[PDB]
Ligand binder design. Structure first.
Ligand SMILES: *[C@@H]1O[C@H](CO)[C@@H](O)[C@H](O)[C@H]1NC(C)=O
Ligand SMILES: *[C@@H]1O[C@H](CO)[C@@H](O)[C@H](O)[C@H]1NC(C)=O
Ligand SMILES: *[C@@H]1O[C@H](CO)[C@@H](O)[C@H](O)[C@H]1NC(C)=O
Ligand SMILES: *[C@@H]1O[C@H](CO)[C@@H](O)[C@H](O)[C@H]1NC(C)=O
Length: 438
């Protein structure tokens, strides 16, 4: 009941919604001031979904550190009581890198939801599908296709025995690969340390108090600030790795107060903002490949790009068809942040304060949790309306209508295609990709 196909993960939302990019997808449809519904007189003629992979186990690296930290807490501490008792016996048995059962289901759900929302097209049109080449992203693509195909089969209006939807293109994450979904070739951006600095500066403003209380409660234990954030991370990973994802919040969660979760969440928005978003000088530049691919799709014309795009892939109709109506792309949070910013979507957002928490009003809709949670989705729609000769573009971020920037937006969040594309002059010029090397 608190976890559904349509509304996502609304369980314990006072905690679970502040885990940033470790938050399980939760729908923001009700938080949308503008209605997500197709307006009257309007028909959707195009839909692209860009999705993150689903909930996962910790990376092997982080998982070794979590697991070693907890042993140390077990070897050293003398008092494990009250909220701390569970820690004496806690037996680290999380897996590593792979999607969890819960994460698998999120993407099945996401396929169901995309199939249903665009049913008057998904009934007879097989989406053209791409995925960044990482096992968890690929597996996610296939779970999404699973749920989509299940729903098509049950739909009385679906044209049956069409080819299956499949992952048409797996884009390489190798270091030499031009990957629009998650670029790794911008040498100077790859070397950036802005995020780390910001992370440390902000963690120093709220973590030491927590560190202190933990050392106080667990006599014999001594912790770094970084270690405290590991036990904060465990609250998400120990909640959504288990069978009890829907019924029980991890015990890690209750070692920290709501106000500390607020800082945690904000910390997570900072890492993403200065790591991959407008805060980082080459962050939005990581999104221009995809933005140029998006424009080719919207205008049914050849990709004009010389940043992250692979030309062998994009100049062939087989691996980059221009008229497929429906498209699905699967990737990582960091690439999705860059793309969100390269598309102008958060150009109402002032650079985030590195010293003080900012609520979702101050940041004008930007947060890690609101943009790239586990199984995040972005939908780009093109629609044709009664009073207008031109197609109108509309964008939703996790079910929230996000008003376009760079073009004359109407009160429904939309701009004409031609003006939206013209607005994307930063991506059209290649953004700051020339600086990847000087
Ligand atoms: C572009 O894609 C092709 C086809 O998958 C591949 O073999 C080649 O490595 C890619 N080139 C770059 C620069 O990514
Ligand atoms: C546990 O004690 C060891 C050895 O004294 C020390 O080096 C380590 O930092 C302590 N760790 C924690 C998490 O308290
Ligand atoms: C890959 O991107 C680089 C850097 O933008 C570009 O110059 C090169 O020609 C591209 N290679 C392919 C196969 O698209
Ligand atoms: C968004 O603002 C950035 C901030 O520099 C600018 O480069 C970009 O062109 C703007 N994009 C749109 C669509 O307005």
């Amino acid at each position: 009941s608190c976890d559904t196909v349509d509304q996502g993960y609304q369980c314990f939302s006072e905690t679970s919604h502040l885990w940033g990019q470790y938050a399980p997808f939760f729908s923001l449809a009700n938080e949308s001031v503008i209605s997500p519904e197709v307006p009257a007189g309007c028909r959707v003629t195009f839909a692209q979904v860009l999705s993150r992979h689903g909930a996962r186990y910790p990376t092997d690296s982080k998982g070794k550190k979590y697991s070693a930290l907890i042993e140390e807490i077990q070897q050293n501490a003398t008092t494990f009581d009250g909220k701390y008792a569970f820690l004496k016996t806690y037996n680290y048995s999380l897996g590593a890198d792979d999607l969890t059962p819960f994460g698998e289901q999120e993407l099945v759900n996401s396929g169901i939801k995309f199939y249903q929302r665009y049913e008057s097209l998904t009934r007879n049109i097989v989406p053209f599908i791409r995925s960044s080449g990482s096992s968890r992203v690929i597996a996610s693509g296939k779970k999404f296709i699973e749920g989509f195909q299940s729903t098509k089969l049950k739909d009385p209006r679906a044209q049956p025995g069409q080819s299956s939807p499949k992952i048409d293109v797996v884009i390489s994450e190798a270091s030499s690969s031009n990957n629009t979904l998650d670029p790794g070739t911008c040498t100077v951006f790859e070397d950036s340390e802005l995020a780390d600095t910001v992370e440390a500066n902000f963690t120093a403003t709220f973590v030491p108090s927590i560190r202190q209380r933990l050392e106080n409660d667990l006599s014999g234990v001594t912790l770094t600030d970084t270690e405290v954030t590991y036990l904060m991370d465990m609250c998400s990973f120990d909640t959504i790795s288990t069978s009890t994802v829907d019924t029980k919040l991890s015990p890690f969660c209750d070692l920290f107060t709501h106000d500390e979760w607020i800082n945690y969440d904000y910390l997570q928005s900072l890492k993403k903002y200065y790591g991959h978003g407008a805060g980082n000088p080459l962050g939005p530049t990581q999104g221009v490949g995809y933005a140029n691919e998006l424009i080719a799709r919207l205008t049914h014309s050849p990709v004009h790009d010389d940043t992250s795009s692979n030309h062998t892939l994009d100049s062939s109709p087989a691996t980059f068809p221009l008229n497929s109506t429906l498209y699905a792309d699967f990737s990582h949070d960091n690439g999705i942040i860059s793309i969100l910013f390269a598309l102008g979507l958060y150009n109402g957002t002032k650079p985030l304060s590195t010293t003080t928490v900012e609520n979702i009003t101050q940041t004008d809709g930007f947060s890690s949790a609101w943009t790239v949670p586990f199984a995040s989705r972005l939908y780009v729609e093109m629609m044709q309306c009664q009073a207008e000769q031109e197609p109108l573009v509309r964008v939703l971020v996790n079910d929230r209508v996000v008003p376009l920037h760079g073009c004359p937006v109407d009160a429904l969040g939309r701009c004409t295609r031609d003006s939206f594309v013209r607005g994307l002059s930063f991506a059209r010029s290649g953004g700051d990709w020339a600086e990847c090397f000087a």
